[PDB]
């Protein structure tokens, strides 16, 4: 069935992408402790992995002889809904990661006792600073942190593209 193994391969590809996203998010959370949940989309990775889980369950039910066709098209509508939800969540993650990288491109940071103090240049002598605790050297913020952000945004855009083309094929077979 040409139209049947395509959801399976898309589901496993999205599983791999979500696993990579969650790993990158946990690495970012391990970079420093003072950061917030809004900063890293590891929650988004968890959500899209739950999306992959429910998609796998629906595909397993559908591959076996379904009890009801009513359940079948209800589950297909749910599959379309979750593909759209994964798309919107990945888009939000892309936007947040891009904004955070754009922010981190324009901070000057210095090493504080077991921490970092990153302040921004201002015309007035006063300025707003931020404290990143449990950070020995600020290079970890200027090094692996921005690499992690780039990998996270690449994975998020790839996953969003996957969800969008999944919706594309769904309505190319549905409308």
Describe the overall structure:
The protein has helices spanning 2-31, 42-63, 69-104, 139-142, 144-172, and strands at 108-112, 115-119, 129-133. With 175 residues, it is mainly alpha-helical. A three-stranded antiparallel β-sheet has the order 1-2-3, with no helix packed on it. A hairpin with a 2-residue loop joins strand 1 (108-112) and strand 2. Helix 1 (2-31) runs antiparallel to helix 2 (42-63), helix 2 runs antiparallel to helix 3 and helix 3 runs antiparallel to helix 5. The longest helix is centred in the middle third of the chain and has 36 residues, at 69-104. The protein is elongated and about 70 Å long.
Trace the largest sheet across and list its strands.
Answer: 1-2-3
Strand content: 5-15%
Q: Please give the largest β-sheet.
A: 3 strands, antiparallel
Written as H for each helix and E for each strand, in order along the chain, the element string is HHHEEEHH
Please report the total strand number as a whole number: 3
Q: What structural class do helix, strand and pairing data support?
A: mainly alpha
Overall shape: it is: elongated
Helix content: 55-70%
Number of helices: 5
Query: Radius of gyration from the CA trace?
Result: 21 Å
End-to-end distance: 20 Å
């Amino acid at each position: 069935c040409c139209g049947c193994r395509f959801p399976l391969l898309l589901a496993l590809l999205q599983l791999a992408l979500g696993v990579a996203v969650t790993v990158v998010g946990f690495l970012m959370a391990s970079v420093s402790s003072s950061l917030l949940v809004r900063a890293t989309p590891y929650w988004a990775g968890i959500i899209v992995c739950v999306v992959a889980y429910l998609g796998l369950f629906m595909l397993c039910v559908s591959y076996q002889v379904d009890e009801r066709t009513c359940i079948q098209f209800s589950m297909k509508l749910l599959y379309f809904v979750l593909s759209a939800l994964g798309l919107v969540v990945c888009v939000l993650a892309v936007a947040f990661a891009a904004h955070h990288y754009s922010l981190l491109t324009h901070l000057t940071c210095e090493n504080a006792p077991d921490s970092c103090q990153c302040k921004l240049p201002s015309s007035e002598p006063l300025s707003r600073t931020f404290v990143y605790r449990d950070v020995t050297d600020c290079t970890s913020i200027t090094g692996t942190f921005q690499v992690f952000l780039l990998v996270q945004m690449v994975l998020n855009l790839v996953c969003g593209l996957v969800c969008l083309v999944a919706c594309f094929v769904m309505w190319k077979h549905r409308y």
